[PDB]
């Protein structure tokens, strides 16, 4: 078993820190929880430590650790995410909200001690103050999406594309095209995968005891799209 | 604002039974776990006792305990489900798969000891053998849906309509019109609510150790549409 894989055989504690700025609105988010790569399961609680969140939590879901995906035995040679650990990897994305603004995020996912940490900087621009994002017009949920992964030998990493369909209250959808890139932080070799996808599910809830602006998040992710 | 609701202040253990007949394909399912109505949380594991499951697991999620919904304080007046307990209620559905067969279901949801139990009888019919259902063409997932609820004093229960969209592998969708009816077991008083809805979220996973055909189901349901 790979040296990186061995780090994910059990439950792993997680910390997430995010500094964001959307149209001048600055906000910070803190996250705590754990992941079980064996089950492809991830449980996290997030707190907007600066007060009210100026954007809807659902738009932050992809930003706030694919290393907790479940790669079946037959697909373990395609797990870039776990193979770059514990030095970790950089996750960069540009999210384009159809007919509205865009996020630019850069993050480092790596072990600090025994804990896997996701440190993020997010910058948003061109948002319509009356729009679905700044106007908080999005339902508090997240639909199932397939995340497509493709190797990039020359950058020693992976390229990932997918478009999110956020439910709007009225009964329509807001599109958010995701363009992602992951490169290892360490100098050690990683696994370049063949084209595949992650089948991702998210459930969002609240803690009735929590008064701060918050999001309880559950993800269920399993790699697929390759035979045995 | 009733006796029933007091039964759900904690974590309540659950059992589920289904016996299935679909285009003659007979099958049986057992489920266990727990529900936590104050978080609107429901965790259940189901196994197909009778070998490989003839239909996709997502088509049965609606069938395999809306009494585990979180009703916010200012809305308890409208929680029919917990108001019919411990006695219990009968949940009855017809589900029409657009351009495909239909499922009929009668279930009995009520306590049996300290345990809440959902006993289901399901009949499916007119399904296209190479249709999305029997053809096993549905993605293994369940998108969020609103479940609309209307009071019906005639039968001293509620009427319910929702449309499920099951993702099909190819990226298209399979419609499933849910028509539902909930009547009490007991003859005690139950609460008949003004029009509201349940925001329903469902996540499906596998136990990597479980060697039978199964589904792990997690549900987060909160009532809304009134303040």
Numbering used by the authors:
A (entry chain A): 1 to 64, 68 to 231
B (entry chain C): 1 to 64, 68 to 230
The authors write:
BrUSLEE (Bright Ultimately Short Lifetime Enhanced Emitter) is a new green FP probe (λex/ λem 487/509 nm) with two reliably detected time-resolved FL components: a short one with a subnanosecond FL and a τ of ~0.66 ns, and a long one with a τ~1.5 ns. BrUsLEE shows an exceptional fluorescence brightness of the short FL component, reaching ~78% of that of the green EGFP precursor. The BrUsLEE demonstrates high performance in the multiparameter FLIM experiments and allows both a reliable detection of the probe and the recording of distinct FL signals in the presence of spectrally similar GFPs.
The crystal asymmetric unit of BrUSLEE contains three dimers AC, BD, and EF. Each dimer comprises two monomers related by a noncrystallographic twofold symmetry axis with a side-to-side packing at ~120°. The principal structural fold of the BrUSLEE monomer, shared with all other members of the GFP family, is an 11-stranded β-barrel with loop caps from both sides. The nearest shell of the Gly65-Tyr66-Gly67 chromophore is composed of 19 residues, forming an extensive H-bond network around the chromophore. The substitutions increased the free volume around the chromophore, causing a 0.7 Å shift of the hydroxyl group of Tyr66. The mutation of the chromophore Thr65 to Gly shifted the H-binding of catalytic Glu222 from Thr65 to the imidazolinone nitrogen, and the replacement of Phe165 with Tyr led to the formation of an H-bonded chain–Tyr165∙∙∙∙Arg96∙∙∙∙O=C-imidazolinone. An increase in the distance between the His148 side chain and the Tyr66 hydroxyl from 2.89 Å to 3.52 Å indicated the disruption of another H-bond, typically stabilizing the position of the chromophore. These rearrangements in the nearest chromophore environment did not affect its absorbance and emission spectra but greatly impacted its FL, which predominantly depends on the chromophore’s local microenvironment. Compared to the EGFP precursor, which is characterized by an increased packing density in the chromophore area, in BrUSLEE the stabilizing contacts of the chromophore with the environment were noticeably weaker.
